[PDB]
Each structure stands twice: as structure tokens, then as C-alpha cells.
Amino acid sequence: KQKSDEWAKKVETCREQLQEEIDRLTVEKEKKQEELRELRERDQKEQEEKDRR
Amino acid sequence: ESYDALMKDQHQKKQEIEEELAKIIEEVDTLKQLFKEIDEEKQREREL
């Protein structure tokens, strides 16, 4: 019983840690990707202008 | 098992976020650098 309760305690600790790390990961998510994609269409428009010229 | 079960799922999920948040910074930097070169040549061409 002591071993199993220690197991459960480790369960809570690991879950809280993982939740924190994943939450930070998501908070950082979808910020640089927008800039990269916008630069992508910007270069596409520049190249199309160049080719039509 | 529950712990195991939970952990597996959770761990896997985090990886995707990493995958959707990692190995993209350098691509952004490279595109920005090429844009900088293109705009600098544009400015030089326009000055000429």
C-alpha cells in the first residue's frame, strides 16, 4: 500500500510537470509560424510580379 | 496502467507541439534573409 501510494504521488507530480511543459509549448506555438507563412505568400507575390514583368 | 496509459497519451501529444514548434525557426530566418537581400537589391535598382 505504501509503495502504491508513492506510485500515485509520482503520478500526480509527473502529470503536473507534463501539463506545465506542454502548456508552455502551446503558449509559444503559432507565433513564428504566421510570420513564416506570411513571408511565404509575400515571396510568392514578389516572384509572380517579377515573372509577369 | 492508468498512469502508464495517461502518460503515453500525454507524452505523445507534447511531441507534436514540439514538432509544430521546432525546426521552423531557421526556415523563418532564411526566408527573412533572402527577403532582406531582395529588398536591398530592389532599393539599389530603384536608386540607379
Lay out the secondary structure:
This is part of a larger assembly, with chains A (53 residues) and B (48 residues).
Chain A: H1 2-28, H2 32-52
Chain B: H1 2-21, H2 25-47
Protein described:
- The structure is cut from a larger assembly and holds chains A (53 residues) and B (48 residues).
- Chain A has 53 residues and is mostly helical.
- Chain A contains 2 helices and no strands.
- Chain A has helices spanning 2-28, 32-52.
- The longest helix of chain A has 27 residues, at 2-28.
- Chain A is rod-shaped, with a radius of gyration of 24 Å.
- With 48 residues, chain B is an all-alpha fold.
- Chain B has 2 helices and no strands.
- Chain B has helices spanning 2-21, 25-47.
- Chain A: It is found in: Cell projection; Cytoplasm, Cytoskeleton.
- Chain A: It comes from Tetrahymena thermophila (strain SB210).
- Chain A: This is Dynein regulatory complex protein 9.
- Chain A: Residues 30-53 are annotated as: Disordered.
- Chain B: It is found in: Cytoplasm, Cytoskeleton, Flagellum axoneme.
- Chain B: Belongs to the DRC10 family.
Approximate strand percentage of chain A: under 5%
- Number of DSSP helices of chain B? 2
Q: What fraction of the residues of chain B are assigned to beta strands by DSSP?
A: under 5%
Class computed from helices, strands and strand pairing of chain A: mainly alpha
**Whole-number radius of gyration of chain A?**
24 Å
Helix content of chain A: over 70%
What's the helix-strand series of chain B? Answer: HH
Largest pleated sheet of chain A: none
What is the number of beta strands of chain B? Answer: 0
Rg of chain B is 22 Å
Q: Number of helical segments of chain A?
A: 2
* Molecular shape of chain A: rod-shaped
The class by helix and strand makeup of chain B works out as mainly alpha
Distance between the termini of chain B: 72 Å
Strand count, sense and barrel status of the largest sheet of chain B are: none
**Overall geometric form of chain B:** rod-shaped
Largest interface: A-B, 22 and 20 residues
For the terminal residues of chain A, how far apart are their CA atoms?
A: 78 Å
- The helix content of chain B is over 70%
Strands of chain A, total number: 0
Which assembly state applies to the chains in this document?
Answer: part of a larger assembly
PDB class: structural protein
Keywords: nexin-dynein regulatory complex, cilia, axoneme, dynein, structural protein
Entry title: Linker domain of Nexin-dynein regulatory complex from Tetrahymena thermophila
Chain A: Dynein regulatory complex protein 9
